[model samples]
Target chain A: SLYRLIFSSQGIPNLQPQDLKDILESSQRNNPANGITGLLCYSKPAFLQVLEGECEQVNETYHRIVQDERHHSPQIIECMPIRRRNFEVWSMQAITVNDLSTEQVKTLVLKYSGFTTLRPSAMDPEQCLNFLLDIAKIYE
Target chain B: SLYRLIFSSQGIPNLQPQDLKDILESSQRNNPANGITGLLCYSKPAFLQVLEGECEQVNETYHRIVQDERHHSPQIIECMPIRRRNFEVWSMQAITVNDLSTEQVKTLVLKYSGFTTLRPSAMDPEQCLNFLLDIAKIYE
Candidate 1:
């Protein structure tokens, strides 16, 4: 069975560009031995990630993650067991983190807090991957 | 969130056809008061049903079902919480007991059990629900 873990952390400031890069590198290196694959998305106030692999490996990594020192108290909000693998290829893909202005951060906070009716932008990785490619096209 | 206890049961050989009819009719009459609704499909060996309602009411009814003497050693399988109501409009819809011939049942059993593949069927409710009325004609 494929599994996913989604969680949120509070009290962490926005990540620096180097911080995001280092985290991704470390995660990929640490997880390869376990045959784990997934994606990570983080904004200033919250982080949402999906991990896929053998059930035991995923659970082991998740347990290790909760004790990591960089982030304040983390809360695991969702855990799902799925019948199919959604991220079979990526060992670990981290979304680019950009600093948002105060107003933008406020808007995000509202969205995350569920104060507004806005839905979490869909987290379907396939659609997000396609959208990322479209953005890359403009840069090219 | 409104929760429901949905499950399926099997092994009721001694239950007369008239007894089954009376049970169905009584369930239909009482379903509305308890906000309960469901579909029951039965054959000689087993019955598959999906019930939707307030958790407490469904749990109470399920208790009665298990205690009923006419059904011998009924086994409840696949009970869980659901996010959506399945039979809200029909108080107790007894959809056609799919007369899948023994050959068809054997085929399904072999296909699912023989291979490790976990592909969703085209006839799955979640997939079928997305089909427009016109597009669904293709299935026939």
Candidate 2:
């Protein structure tokens, strides 16, 4: 079984396109080493994301991610056990907030994540899955 | 008075962190030279933005933006005349969609842009002005 956790956060100052790349590169290269895989979607004042792996590994990564200074005000949207991984292929793919229509983007997340608003959330697993699946494929 | 135009579009694929930086750098350096200023908010599949300058410069830049292969499917959200330039100081600032709280972000834009949703639109001048102003100061 795997554990999938979804979370959101605020980005810190100096977190620009290049900084995002630095974070993405680190995650994509290193996450697979820990049996970690999932998607990372970021925009200003928020980082909506998902993580799937062993319960221990994923949770540990979650802890570290929360402690990261690159972003602030961490909020866990969901942390549930799952038998399958939705983002199995991505190590930590990133997407700009501009990728999808706000209607679809918010509807997708709020519809699935138990969130009344898409700005933040404990991530609903299904919502998290759908969000990642949509844009993460561009990395392919 | 300057004209303010708000628009959005999809970014080209394989547009990595460095590529976004490349885009940001180009806009910052050149916009000032052209007497254009505003903010670029980006993410997957979309580039939510505001541009402010002379009617001619802004329109010319908008045409160039649409022609660029780096991004596509350009849609003009707002093309309103304004008595003021809210972002008169910046060349072209950038922000991830996640940089601000969802509530504040949505409220600011929707209330001002006359939008019920965050999907791109011919935006509200006041809303767009305030949104850009808050973040633009951060760049100072």
Candidate 3:
């Protein structure tokens, strides 16, 4: 079964601007090798992201993320089987909360969470995918 | 010089919902005794917060938070002196990230950092204060 995991976490003190680009480059390369498809949304200390792929691949990738020292307090927003991948076109993509509109943000936020703070418990997989899809415009 | 530090961190596996209330209640009871003033924002795995008063009190309280086993990786987003406490109206107040609007959040976030994440280096002090001020609407 295909699966998805959405989460949010804080950054380490040493996290720098270049570090993000390097991490994303590494993520895109490594995730594809692991059969993972996802989008990484970062805005400083908080990382709101969604990983999509095989259940095992998704879970393992998430575990790797949680174990990374650069990230802490990883929580699952939503995980479930889906007929197809929402982010099938990309192995992994990067986005910032700034990329989204206020209305779009609020719509997804309220739909998935009780509070505005990002967490897996409050993330919506469909919304996560849609936001990503919206960014790419076409998921190929 | 007095200082106020704002930060966000992740909780350990054991943090309960009731724990926040208990912690906040105890904080309200204990903070004034130490002459500290601030607010705690919670949204599960993430905690956004501000602490105020003498530099020593702020630093000590921060150290205590770092030492707490219940939480991990407390990263300060801002630490600087001010003429007085912005949250002086309350010894300690508790709120959720849900309380803030999308526009308000984005404005504070962009003013502070590259992405939407929260970090001391990336945080905008004035925007943060404005966000807090906007919350209290009026402070004593």
Candidate 4:
């Protein structure tokens, strides 16, 4: 069965732009063969990721992610079987708060949270998912 | 802000058809004014419902539902603020396993679960949401 796993993590301080590129490149190169598709959203020191694929593959990928040195304090917000992929078009699409204008970012952030910041920890699982959905729709 | 709440319950045995009608009528008449929208799927004694609207209204409505004698053992599957409504067309849309052909029901149920029966408790929160989503798509 297909599954989706949503998680939030804290990125290492002083993240380099190249590090984001490397993660995206590696996800695109590695995910397709494993039948994985997802969106990765980064906001300063926080990261919220959504992965969809075969149940076992998704599980394995998440376990691998937990070991990555780039992020820590990983929290699994949601993990369950899904009838279809919500991000099927992307092997791994990356987005940062900087990708949107200040006003747009504030609007999106405030829609799902109490503040004008993208903090997955403060948002519920549904909020995190919806925030990503809105971002994906906006970009598409 | 818009909120979505998903829940599961076991209906009383020997449920009358009129009871379902009454619930639907009540929902349609009452929900819209409260800014509620949702899908209700009943399979025998099992009920899976998705409600969307203002956070406070949704919570109050669910509290009201808990007092109804038609169902028992209500369990919340998901509740959080949303970016938008998934079932905005209807204030309250109702569906059942009987609404689909055996083959179609089997296909849909098997996509998210090991069995053909639509038991919301057996399925995870994501599965339950996707099942309703697929059913809603089919009917639309």
Candidate 5:
């Protein structure tokens, strides 16, 4: 069965553009071979991502992911088998919260979380998935 | 396999509160026996819903739903097998969009669709599901 795992972490305080670029570049390079597909969302110190693939492949990728130095304090929001992929179009798509105008970001964040800030911990698993889906629309 | 069906429709003109009540009552009354569990969202003339259960049972229930007099022009957003149920806690949870404040409704709709109005047709399958999940938060 196909598996999907959602997780969030606090990005490094001094996260550089290249840091994020490298993450996406490596994910796109490696994920296809492993049959992994997902979306990554970044907003300052927060990182929320979805990983979908075979149960073993996704879990293996996730275990390796935690060792990366870009993010810290990781928490697994949800992990379960799914009949289909939601982010199958991309091996890895990244959404930088800063890409949208300030007001647009505020509107999106406030819609999901309590305040205008993008706090992944404040959102439940469903809200986290919904936020990623909404963010995915901007790129689509 | 577990199946989930999502759809939207226009309600009959001059819809009453009792009409919505009857839909929920019947869904709750009838669905539990068939192992169906999901949510319904209503705002003015639009209704967005998720129905989850056995493949045969959900399909059968959806067919009977479209014949109801309260809603019209039912358009299915998605119908597919799912490994797990998203709304397992409810037999049929109803979210009356009108119950929310005007600003709150606008915020929720605008987050998913292009505009402030709740138009399910304007959203894709994933967005439709996300919208339903966000609305579910209010009841939770």
Candidate 6:
């Protein structure tokens, strides 16, 4: 299993909605050839994405993402084996990060920290994903 | 940042004590650069170990270990994240696996299986490590 580091700067406000859709569509098309699959959640300030695949492919993609001009100063906080794929079916599950409450976003950051004290509820990735997807359905 | 997979197998009687020493020494020498550390417990029929390191390095070492001739088909029954380094100070701590009863071992296995019924008294890696270490002292 492989982990990809995802980082992005502020969202581009001037871009039309179609442009954002085009970007997501492009990302979905590009990720699968490398056997990579996962989710991308973006807010104005930052984005968090999770990708899984072979080590080499994941590393290569992560490097490319860091160098992309659309984003800036990417940071990799942690990379570890996810025993099971969290977003196996979605090549690029997209979500506007702002859709989550401030507390919810804080929780996600804490979950990534690997601090035992900051543990999230014992929901597995599937359950969490389902919950998040349900919220997205409301907007749809 | 990393996860460790630790488990044990039956040792070959023909293997010299020096051979065992060499294996442990090699493991010690290899862990630092890769940031991997773990404990190995050995007895006649079964063994147990706890390893910590970058997911790739730890998994690589685990793969190599299973192929070693000294042990036969070592069973890796426990593979979980420590959330933080528990045996970070040791390169590869060696202890006799017989320290824990069959019942206790069974309980540990069950608890880590994403079981909702059995909860560890201390879920934090550090606290759990200290508790296990105290239990190990009883064998001395």
* Maximum-TM-score candidate: 4
Give the root-mean-square deviation of each candidate in angstroms.
12.4, 19.2, 17.3, 12.0, 17.9, 12.2
- Candidates, ranked, lDDT: 4, 5, 2, 3, 6, 1
List the pairs of residues colliding in candidate 6.
none
- lDDT, candidates in the order shown: 0.49, 0.64, 0.62, 0.76, 0.75, 0.51
Native contact fraction (fnat) of model 1: 0.00
lDDT of 2 by residue, B27-118 (tens): 98779987788788764545677877876577667656655667645544455556788765546777766534454565555555554344
Over B55-121, each residue of candidate 3 has an lDDT whose tens digit, in order, gives 6577556656565668866544455546777665456777655434354664554664455544433
Model 6 lDDT tens row, B1-140: 34445444566776455766777887778866756676665544444556677545665565566557777544333344446665655776765433344666535434443542222321333333443454353433
Give the Cα error of residue A78 in candidate 1, in Å.
3.1
Candidate 4 matches the true fold with a TM-score of 0.51
* Residue A109 error, candidate 4, Å: 20
For A1-140, candidate 2 gives per-residue lDDT tens digits of: 35566667778866888888887887877787977887787756578877777655665576567557898655444454566777887776676664354555655555555654455444433455666676575446
TM-score of each: 0.38, 0.42, 0.42, 0.51, 0.49, 0.39
**What local lDDT does model 5 show for residue A88?**
86
TM-score of chain B of each: 0.63, 0.73, 0.72, 0.93, 0.91, 0.64
What is the per-residue lDDT of model 5 for residues B16-105, given as tens digits with 9 covering 90 to 100?
876767877787798888998888887777788988887667766876776577766665556555789997545677777763446576
Query: How is the predicted docking of candidate 2 categorized under the CAPRI scheme?
Result: incorrect
Cα lDDT of candidate 1 equals: 0.49
- Please state the CAPRI-style docking class of candidate 3: incorrect
The top-ranked prediction according to lDDT is 4
What would you estimate as the lDDT of candidate 2? 0.64
Sort the predicted structures by TM-score, highest score first: 4, 5, 2, 3, 6, 1
Q: What are the chain A TM-scores of the candidates, in order?
A: 0.64, 0.77, 0.73, 0.92, 0.93, 0.60
DockQ of candidate 6 against the true complex? 0.03
Better of 4 and 6 by DockQ: 4
Comparing 3 and 6 on TM-score, the stronger one: 3
Better by DockQ, candidate 4 or 2: 4
Q: How much RMSD separates candidate 4 from the native structure?
A: 12.0
